RNA sequence: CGUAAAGCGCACGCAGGCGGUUUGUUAAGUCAGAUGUGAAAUCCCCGGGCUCAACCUGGGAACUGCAUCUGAUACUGGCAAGCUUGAGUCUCGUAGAGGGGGGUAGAAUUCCAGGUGUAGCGGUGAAAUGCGUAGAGAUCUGGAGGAAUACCGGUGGCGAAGGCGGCCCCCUGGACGAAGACUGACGCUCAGGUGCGAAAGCGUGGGGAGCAAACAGGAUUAGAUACCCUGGUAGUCCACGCCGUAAACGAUGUCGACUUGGAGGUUGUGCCCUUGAGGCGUGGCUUCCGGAGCUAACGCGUUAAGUCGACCGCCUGGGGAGUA
């Protein structure tokens, strides 16, 4: 569930500072971390429809954040996508 | 979800009368206070307080001629889903001219009557019969 | 102005919000009435009575609960007024055009009883009129002398007697009710908050009304 | 658009529609004035002329519009900079038949193998078919399996909806709460589209106790292609795919704001005494009764069908026909 420790590493790696936990930049990484994490649990089991709806939400969540962040400051947008491997 | 707080103001007043509350508070905004002055200067409300620093709490003291509500009718027209604008000399009279049509003009908000004597039209906000 | 001890406010948890202006929370989940705003009430409404009483108006005192009905009985029969302590006969006022006929029957029998026919047929049916006299007795006893329409309805309880209040309200007549936490004041004109069903409560009440009505013919 | 025709079964979500609040800014939409033009006729207004009128006819108004120019800057739009009451993230916890996968426990039914023991057993309104002296049923011991989880159990809980129930483990979704920290409008809805979606049914391979369409026999019956009884296949159970429909129903779209009360249930949490199964408050979900009001009425009623705002679906007499 993105163990407390995992977040404590992510926040320090993306936000303006360590106390930051709300910034758009950080939030995206958290979702992606979770998304990548469920891949295994979903490439396997291939049936947990209830769980997948949970996943599907965070996919939507993520996109909306980026679209917001793209129109705001393409700079931070280009870096994050590059530092986080996405935009198929 | 909270698209037009202007309609919200009216409703909180309409519902306020039904419960016969003394005053109905609401999250004030520049535009709303403008309307409040029109009403008070007209006589549909008494003495709005604009208390607020970053949380504008505009509480509207209500008028009661008797154990009957003063505001006999309040309906909004230019809604967010549909704005309405009328030429100067094409404004419509409210209750055969004994109500008011709060209209926003190039000179700000005023009563429909004020608009005619001032000779300018604008966005009609709402009717208060 | 607390004349006597207990009149402060009572009757329930399942109150009536219509009288939210007159409340205080008590240590039983029961309500306590703000008699403070009531002191002006009974003071003021009494003046209304005094004025109308001098107008040679009529004051009708209704009581129920079987407990305080006797107390009310003394109230009307103390100055000159009329009272109704038993079951308020539905519609005596709005339908007085016919209840008038019932009154006449009593008067005749009232004569037929103390001095009139009592043995003409047989004691068994002579008894019939007597027990019938009792029926009209508890109903139109203290009202027989009115013969018209009253002009003021002083009512003890608004719960049991909402029936008459609405009827009186339906006519061009003012009413005075000692409403309680679970009473609807909206059917009353000159409301009187406080207790209604307390036995001693009416004793304080009526006598206060009794004096005001006694002098009010000035 | 609760019951008359009318809420997609539920959901995510691009275009599209709409969008909190502060200030400045620009002047697009909007407004004022002027101008160019908006053919004449016709209509309208006031006149005039044919004996009046119809009719002809003078001047005006109008031509509801469009383009340009100059001012106005409230409201909406574009831009820039913020704010935090919307939304979202984190920390510590809580309840739960939330979902998928792997094991597992006991009762019972059926069948098989024996022991004991003897004329019924079973079934029904009665009865018959049927099982039985090759020895049943009943009862005892052992074994084989398949499916479902008594009691707890609660208009109790969880889930978008369909749904979901013994116990243990693994992987995992969501909801809600205390206290603050943080991001800074990042929203609401949503045609097309994608996904999920009871039972039945379909395909490939397993499994097959009980139950049971079809089917058979026996009754009932005027008939009985049924209702009842004795048996019984597909199916129902597992795996992977398809189907996409339900009176998929609070017959009530989603989201947000405002508007008297009462009794309950359930899950958090601060405080007074835990001084004694408690008292005082504040939140989430849910049950019932009813005020105003609403409504055709029944009824709904702070979980609204009340008062309003945003967006989407849908209805337009019945039958024909949700059919060709």
UniProtKB/Swiss-Prot annotation, chain A:
Known partners and oligomeric status: Part of the 30S ribosomal subunit. Forms a bridge to the 50S subunit in the 70S ribosome, contacting the 23S rRNA.
Cross-referenced HAMAP family: Ribosomal_uS15_B (MF_01343_B)
Keywords: Ribonucleoprotein, Ribosomal protein, RNA-binding, rRNA-binding, Translation regulation
SMART domains attached to this UniProt entry: Ribosomal_S15
Homology family: Belongs to the universal ribosomal protein uS15 family.
Protein name as it appears in the record: Small ribosomal subunit protein uS15
Biological process according to GO: cytoplasmic translation; regulation of translation; ribosomal small subunit assembly; translation
GO molecular function, one term: small ribosomal subunit rRNA binding
Induction and repression of expression: Part of the metY operon that extends to pnp, also has its own promoter.
A Pfam family of this chain: Ribosomal_S15
InterPro entries for this protein: Ribosomal_uS15, Ribosomal_uS15_bac-type, uS15_NS1_RNA-bd_sf
Gene source species: Escherichia coli (strain K12)
Ribonucleoprotein as UniProt keyword: yes
Protein origin, superkingdom: Bacteria
UniProtKB/Swiss-Prot annotation, chain B:
Assembly: Part of the 30S ribosomal subunit. Contacts proteins S5 and S12.
GO molecular function: rRNA binding; structural constituent of ribosome
SUPFAM superfamilies attached to this UniProt entry: Ribosomal protein S8
Gene Ontology biological process: cytoplasmic translation; regulation of mRNA stability; regulation of translation; ribosomal small subunit assembly
Function: One of the primary rRNA binding proteins, it binds directly to 16S rRNA central domain where it helps coordinate assembly of the platform of the 30S subunit. Protein S8 is a translational repressor protein, it controls the translation of the spc operon by binding to its mRNA.
Keywords: Repressor, Ribonucleoprotein, Ribosomal protein, RNA-binding, rRNA-binding, Translation regulation
Keyword Disulfide bond on entry: no
Cellular-component GO terms for this entry: cytoplasm; cytosol; cytosolic small ribosomal subunit
Species whose genome carries this gene: Escherichia coli (strain K12)
Record-stated family: Belongs to the universal ribosomal protein uS8 family.
Protein name: Small ribosomal subunit protein uS8
InterPro entries membership: Ribosomal_uS8, Ribosomal_uS8_CS, Ribosomal_uS8_sf
Name of the gene this protein is made from: rpsH
UniProtKB/Swiss-Prot annotation, chain C:
Any one GO molecular-function label of the UniProt entry: zinc ion binding
GO process annotations (BP): cytoplasmic translation; ribosomal small subunit assembly
Stored Pfam families: Ribosomal_S2
Residues where N6-succinyllysine is found: 107
Keywords: Ribonucleoprotein, Ribosomal protein
A GO CC term attached to the entry: cytoplasm
InterPro entries: Ribosomal_uS2 (IPR001865), Ribosomal_uS2_bac/mit/plastid (IPR005706), Ribosomal_uS2_CS (IPR018130), Ribosomal_uS2_flav_dom_sf (IPR023591)
Protein family membership: Belongs to the universal ribosomal protein uS2 family.
Complex and partners: Part of the 30S ribosomal subunit, contacts bS1. Some nascent polypeptide chains are able to cross-link to this protein in situ. In collided ribosomes contacts ribosome rescue factor SmrB.
Name recorded for this polypeptide: Small ribosomal subunit protein uS2
Gene name of the encoded protein: rpsB
